[PDB]
Ligand binder design. Structure first.
Ligand SMILES: Nc1ccn([C@H]2C[C@H](O)[C@@H](COP(=O)(O)OP(=O)(O)OP(=O)(O)O)O2)c(=O)n1
Ligand SMILES: [Mn+2]
Ligand SMILES: [Mn+2]
Length: 333
């Protein structure tokens, strides 16, 4: 038996059902491209169940008793087991709609709504986008300029080099300020699409004005290709960057998100930013539906009492929600 919420079970980085989960995730992604959010979530949940299993699914009889495995997902696994291929998945892969939506949405600064609009307006290729620069934001222009590098998986070796320069800039700007690697790399991933860093200082308020100083230092070192700074609006101060990472004999553009949180909110920010995306969605749904609390990256709010939970760590937050603690490497839902 396996619990229904992804936040109630460990999901390790590596598992026994990668073929099956990949197929389901292609269908989830395609659903998202069509605005079918219910179907996306359904396929994502089924895939995440497969990732939690201790053994490969070799026969359809092994699906018995598993949550989030309705008819459609079961059929997909069945076809794969029996024929080595699922016709629906193959049709999606070969479809111009899917291929174009994948192409566009992968670009830095492009979401589903933008990609769909462009598709509807007859754009198909990266060259098509470059021929219509008036349709692009400055962020999207930068994404197109560096698209080859940005499509190349970011490696742990890149992360370690980037963490060094970010730590050096932070330390020189403000002694005592800290840099914490978050995102997929905190969960143990060997690769990723970017590097996510969370910045704070143990004295609340000492982090004010830190990020612009950090960016000035990095820019002066030639390490920044693109930088968009945004102050907290609603809602953390952040900088969406493309770094120029030096390599032996060359260099590589790499997406980096730098996020500043006040130390009082750090545990919530670390939890939120560590993911996985599905793990956090499930954690938020659990908090709301089972405990009547609203969890986000800033806090944990009781809407009846109008109170916020004071957490010193991620462990505190899990405990407060009545969940066994899962370290980041078991959040790979
Ligand atoms: N729609 C989103 C987007 C992001 N996040 C959170 C969870 C992610 O882990 C984190 C960082 O976002 P990324 O897109 O960088 O996700 P990962 O770092 O997990 O994956 P990758 O290896 O592709 O960078 O922010 C989220 O909850 N919901
Ligand atoms: Mn990331
Ligand atoms: Mn990111």
């Amino acid at each position: 038996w396996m619990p229904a919420y992804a936040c109630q079970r460990p999901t390790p980085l590596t598992h026994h059902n990668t073929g099956l989960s990949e197929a389901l995730e292609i269908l989830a992604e395609a659903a998202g491209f069509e605005g079918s959010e219910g179907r996306l979530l359904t396929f994502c949940r089924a895939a995440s169940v497969l990732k939690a299993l201790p053994s490969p699914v070799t026969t359809l009889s092994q699906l018995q008793g598993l949550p989030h495995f309705g008819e459609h997902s079961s059929r997909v696994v069945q076809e794969l087991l029996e024929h080595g291929v699922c016709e629906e998945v193959e049709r999606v892969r070969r479809s111009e709609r899917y291929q174009t939506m994948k192409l566009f949405t992968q670009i830095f600064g492009v979401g589903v709504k933008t990609a769909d609009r462009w598709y509807r307006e007859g754009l198909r290729t990266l060259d098509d986008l470059r021929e219509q620069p008036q349709k692009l934001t400055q962020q999207q222009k930068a994404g197109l300029q560096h698209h080859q590098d940005l499509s190349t998986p970011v490696l742990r070796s890149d992360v370690d080099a980037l963490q060094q320069v970010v730590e050096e800039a932070v330390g020189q700007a403000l002694p005592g300020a800290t840099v914490t690697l978050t995102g997929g790399f905190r969960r143990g991933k060997l690769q990723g699409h970017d590097v996510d860093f969370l910045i704070t200082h143990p004295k609340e308020g000492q982090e004010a004005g830190l990020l612009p100083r950090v960016m000035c230092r990095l820019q002066d070192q030639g390490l920044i290709l693109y930088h968009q700074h945004q102050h907290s609006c609603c809602a953390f101060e952040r900088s969406f960057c493309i770094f120029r990472l030096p390599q032996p004999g060359s260099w590589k553009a790499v997406r980096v998100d730098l996020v500043v949180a006040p130390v009082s909110q750090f545990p919530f920010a670390l939890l939120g930013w560590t993911g996985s995306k599905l793990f956090q969605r499930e954690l938020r749904r659990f908090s709301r539906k089972e405990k009547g609390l609203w969890l986000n990256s800033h806090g944990l709010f009781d809407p009846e009492q109008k109170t916020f939970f004071q957490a010193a760590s991620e462990e505190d937050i899990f405990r407060h929600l009545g969940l066994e603690y899962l370290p980041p490497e078991q959040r790979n839902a």
